[model samples]
Target: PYDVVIIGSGLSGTMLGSILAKHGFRIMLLDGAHHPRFAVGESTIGQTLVVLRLISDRYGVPEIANLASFQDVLANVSSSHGQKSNFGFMFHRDGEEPDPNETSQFRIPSIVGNAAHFFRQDTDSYMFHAAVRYGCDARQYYRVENIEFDDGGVTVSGADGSTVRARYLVDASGFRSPLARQLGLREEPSRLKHHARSIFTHMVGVDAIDDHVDTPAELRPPVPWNDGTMHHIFERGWMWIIPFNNHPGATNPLCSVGIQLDERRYPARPDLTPEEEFWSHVDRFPAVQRQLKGARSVREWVRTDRMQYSSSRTVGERWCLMSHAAGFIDPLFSRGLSNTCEIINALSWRLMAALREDDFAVERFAYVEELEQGLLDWNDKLVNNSFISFSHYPLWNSVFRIWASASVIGGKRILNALTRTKETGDDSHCQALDDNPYPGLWCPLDFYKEAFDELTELCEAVDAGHTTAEEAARVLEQRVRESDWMLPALGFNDPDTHHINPTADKMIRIAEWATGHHRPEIRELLA
Candidate 1:
């Protein structure tokens, strides 16, 4: 009997193998299908790069590090079709310089040239191939029909009328896990409060000028078009485009169109190629239609229904899930791959530590349970935040100060806030009367703390009639200038003097953006 039996040869499966085998466990990695499969889901964020580097020794995907150059990664600003989409750019509002008198953190949108699917497929295939090459006994095209788990191990049956056993069985199967079904863990169809499907295909002759593409209203500067992350957020739905870098030594960039629709606008339509359906939808959007004026499809289109579930319950014993098999948010926020990569990094280490401690094995299960719930909480926050950011939060608005403060702390903490939202329920002295509202809010930092504590004391003095409003305002503004040195302490590392807060111009720019977004609270604070 093998020490561990891993079913599925995707990213999670390979990751499990890499972790277990490196710990000296005799592992059997099984794949019902062959290698070099055609798959999508390609795109990586900054957080993904961090996690991959953390597990570099174990996972052994050295190529990930080469794609880590921040400027190199963000050069291309499209996401229709590309393999190494590490070259997408993010945009900062034009004329926005650093600021200290007002809250000045900015949220830069991702721009890509290819779809996320290609990256998703290629990363999994590479990880799987690497796992097999580096000590895991991987079996391909060996369909696992049944599995019986007991003290001796898990005895798995094969479609070829054969059997093999292992002490532990892992179901890293994507959305389609036969093991989950046989054990009654089939996914019950649940709709995303916001539902959508995608129609994507490769194409040629699209007008993307000179490998440089800027934001919609030229609010942000232009960057290289190839290998960048791009988004088209419209009323009906959205579309993503990505450009392929050097994969298979070829350079024909691919483009994909995704649309989200209600049941009324988008019924269950069949008998159409992914390209045809996408073009039909594109014709509906004047902006997208203008871009595709001369473009022609070079490949058949692909389509799939997508959603974000609040949570996913556990099934079977000592077996769980990763990636989409677990809970998920929409792909718009670029959280899909990052969430999986982050969770698996934590989960894999916990598994390693559990095997090392013989007496702690029972407690290990409990820890895993806690970890899974944390992931669910994280997923929920992701869904809610993306929805709010897309629909409610205005571009570069004041609410971002809270988000930045929370982000500096951690995402999981933000998740904790969402799960226990009922307990707190937005009861802060400062946040309570705010124009922008969030039910479960938690930020203890003061917006003006970058200035002096004495100045804040004086503001209270002025409020209590100890000083005049004009006098307090003068002292406060002076205090802000005196404490301007704190920006570097908080980790601002731009070499440009414009990036450094001199006149606090960026704060004014953010206030204007926020004001335009209907968030008057921040603009009032600035005034």
Candidate 2:
């Protein structure tokens, strides 16, 4: 029998298979579709970069780790990428152009900064090729005909009269999980509070924000807005603009852009063409229109009814689901890939231990379910809660401050752990388990849940017209100030200033402040 059989040769499946194979396990990766395919969820934040580096280093795959920075990726692999120096947000008010005062740029640290806007097609292909090079039996254009699990193992058959038996089966097929559907594990939609739909595609000829609007040089960010993942915020939802050729000397001429709308507030318009529907919304905001004035879509726009979903369960007797198969919240925060890597890292280790003892018991793999579900719950709360803040810039500013702080703490902790591991030449720093090794992976879950719960309560109160923006801001400010981990002094305390560049030095100061206050929230979690 084979060591493991994984369905869906997407990035997650391929990467997991490669990792398992590296541990000397025989892996079969089956994909219904071929490589060089197009997919969304392209942006990577700081935390994701950290996880990628950790996984690549631990698994002895330098190519994957080399993608941790846009600069490195462009120099080594492919130049079909965009440099993300920071995250920029431009808030909009209906019937008026975007105000320069309402814009904000959350600059990344100079020492360990700069993420990538990946052309998914190229990135996914690279990962698949890497997996094959690692000796995985990667079969493309093969459709899964049926799957049967029993006390001994799993039997996976192909439509072409091919069959394989393995000690374990893993489903990483994303939204089209045949196993989840056959086993009746799909989650109920009614239980979820937040609802959203997306319309997105690849395009060309998109212009820079500076090319369309006029902002004083002093007010502009150190890096141009087009060089990063730019978010255009409005009442009902937000739009993302990510250009592959945004940086100088880049060769890729394509840009990836999308719009996500709150389904309850603005339902999908199936009656109109996707392009027409997109323009209808864009026409309302002239600044967005100007940014895409001469752009043309390279492909037909893909629209989904609702993007939020979860599986009722992710682990079973002889099988388990990978992150994408377990559940998906949304793409707002770019949590898709990072969350997948976290699960893959943990699951691979667990599987390695289990294989050594020939133990395929469900109990041994239960943590996979817990962590995936826990993360989904956290994603639900974070993304759904932040939707309320989109209606008011002041509320967004307050809410984003909490997100920014939590992000910095999480990123810094991972980076520090990796650096220590490199300095001491010890991998033990990367391996520790309460549930699993890499406690730093889930370090922000508690703080985020606690702080966001309080903030979202206020956000809901305001969005429902129960409180004024001033009152909501006061309430949010007070709640955030009470927490030692919340860096209110940065930009949260100043409403007049919207830009934030909390460099590594500022993070150090924030760390000192948190330590002095006896709040040790992040510190305690990491320890």
Candidate 3:
């Protein structure tokens, strides 16, 4: 029997397969779909890079770190991907021209220096090849219809009813998961609070929104709008413009365009096709309508219904669901790969330990369960709140400030931990990450979790009609002003600040405050 079998050779499956195979675990990867095919979750953030680096560093696989930066990815992997300098948001007013004050830019600072708009087909193909190079046994078009478990091992049957046996099964297959089907672990009417559907496709000739619209000089960010992922948000919906051809030296000319609408507010129209509905919805906002001018889709658009799901349990007897198979929330913050990286880093070492010891117990992977489930639920709350806040930009603005703060704190914490672990050549900092009470972009810092919970609660009030968007915005800003935990240099507390650019020196000041001025317990993670 093979030591381990992974289903769905997407980013996470092949990634874990590569890690295990490098350790001489006899890893086999089975995927119904082939690489060089289309996939979503294309945007990368700072935390994603940190975990990617950790995975490659901890496992002695340096090739994976090529994905850790926009510049490095082009140099080492594929040059077709786009550089992401910032995450830009523009709140639309439907009939009116774009407002100057409604836009915001959270720059992915040069200090962190790791963000990208991935052409997933190219990136996934590279990773899959890397896994193969590392001795992972992978087969494409091997659709798994049935999975049977036994005392000795687990058996997975392909389309022909032929089987592959392995001591353990890692089901990286997403939503329509075969392992979840066999185990009946999926949660129906999924516990996700957010109700949003999407229509997405790759397109060429997409015009830059900045060139078409006229916002004041004062409202524009430090970077070009097309240089990063742009979210054109309006009441009850948003359109994501992720361009692979935006940066200089980019080889690809395709742009990823997706519109996500609140399912309850904009239910499917039987008369209109996905393309018709997409164009029809775009007409609702003149700015968006203009931005898509002369743009034509290069492929058939995919329309989804309420894109959220979760499993009751992510791990079972000799089996585990990695990342998307375990659970998923929306891709609002581009958390898909970042969350996957965290799980891969966490699950890999544990699986390595279990395989060597000849141990496969349900209890061994229990923490993986908590981490995945917790991340999903927390993301559910975050996504749901953003959807609620979409009704008004003031509320959305406040939420944006909170999100920017959370991203920095989480990224800084993880980067510091990894740096320390790298320097010491030990896992103390890495091990402490697992011991932390929070999951999903939260650090061990107490105030960060407190802020996250409080911010979420405020959004809930808006959903229930208990608080006006203006009032929620004011109160939220007030709390931000009062919170000592927020970085003074970043100025998320300042409501007028439309763009956030954190220089290296500014970040150092925040680190000093966290280590020297914060609570002693908070200092433990920083110091």
Candidate 4:
């Protein structure tokens, strides 16, 4: 009998084991698969840095830091370093028609940057190794079939006829949560219905400097596309142009390709195997021609089956899930790893608190439920808002799949003030951002849940068959108007804020003038 049994070897499970072990608990960690193998949990954002520091500082896992840095290197485009590590942008594409063959290519006049980037596979492996070294009784390639409580402790079973017993259980199994499955956790759309699927492949032997295309002026340097991040929007899903230090068969660098789907009908034929289907779709995605320019596929592409999930149940005395296991918002703002760490940090704190209090009850499960729902709400709002903003561009019409995918990508940070993607926290800057108390309007929470519901219904309609994007966009706009959710204002808009200080009203007035009508162009640009 072990003190604890953690199922799944992904970052979440691994981290949970490390944390438990660090607290001087005995733990046994197992994974269905091993690392140094392909997985879809890519992308990292700013807040992840804070989680890394915490783990390293508190648990003495310096290797995790080095691995994260190596992952940062995989996201590098120019050997250049600093804030622009994995920065990139999405913009309007010029030309009249939606079809690629019809018009002369032109860049969108305006751009927006999502200061996040992909993780280096090697770095992630490094972290995996680090976790194992830091005292997790880590084992991999042992598939867990089920888990149950017996004699006040948990018993974990594997399909290969292995059984392990533990005093406590941590189900860090990611999307394939074996424990969650056993508990009958149902998946519901937390935000939009599946907007797009991310299909990723590596480009090898690419020159770090010469091979990488020049970044758009608006997205480069001082403008803050994290300096080296590159992005291209194509008809179906947009493509990410990232660089990695080490890759198989290439000294130059590695590039990842991410394709989004506007319509649920994938380009690949359904009868084909997943592998065949991936390549088949790659052949059909319009961006393949341009993104693969002067590049060759060095390995099989890793495509995720629709990245939509929400657990019907998030907690109980016997089990709980982290990250993708509980819920997963879209990846637009690069919230993948950040969300992983966020859930780990949040769950750890809660679990630790419960443990300290000796109170692990059903009410404690509410924390996990709320966190999952909160994340879904955040992503839903963000995805809807991004669609609203990005739709005006005619040339970028083909890229609506990505705009729809806001739920799949950056929806969390874009919506929730509480679900912050940046870690520079609670200082005056964050305090100021949080102090605003608007009444009868969208709080971050309202924005998250409502927008997601609205978009989700629309996405379902679209996925059901024949709803054109133009038609869906109209329905979406109507929903947005009916929701009457207040967008962010530069200043406070409530009585509570006014009572605190007269300066609040004055600031609101100035902000209204600045972000509102006076900056009509900015509003129109973002709109």
Top candidate by lDDT: 3
Against the reference, the lDDT scores of all candidates come to 0.48, 0.77, 0.83, 0.49
Residues 7-109 of candidate 4: C-alpha lDDT, one tens digit per residue: 7777677666667667766678888777766555455444455445444444454544442453344353223212234334444243321232221111111
Model 3, poorest ten-residue lDDT window?
518-527
The total number of steric clashes, by the backbone 3 Å criterion, in model 1 comes to 46
TM-score for each candidate, following the candidate numbering: 0.63, 0.92, 0.97, 0.65
- Please give, for residues 373-409, the per-residue lDDT of candidate 1 as tens digits: 5545544543333332332112212222223323322
Candidate 3, which segments miss by more than 4 Å at Cα? 508-518, 521-527
TM-score attained by model 1: 0.63
- How well is each residue in 1-527 modelled by candidate 2, as lDDT tens digits? 88889988877887888788877898888888898788888888887888888888877777678678887887776779888877889887767888787787777665445688988887788777877888888778888878898878899888899998998888988888878877878887635556788889898999988778777777777667887789999886889999899877889999998888988899767799988988888888888998999999999788888877788788887688888877887777788887888888778888888878888877987877877877777677667767777776767777777776666667766677777788998977777433333232344456566676677677667767888767887777676656555554455445555777776666666655655564555554322
What lDDT score is found at residue 112 in candidate 4? 15
| Highest-scoring model, TM-score | 3
lDDT of 3: 0.83
Q: What is the C-alpha RMSD of each candidate to the true structure, in Å?
A: 13.2, 2.8, 1.7, 9.4
Kindly list the per-residue Cα lDDT of model 3 for residues 434-518, writing each as its tens digit.
Answer: 7777766455467767777787888888888888878888888888878776666777877778788777787776667667764
Ranking by lDDT: 3, 2, 4, 1
Better of 1 and 2 by lDDT: 2
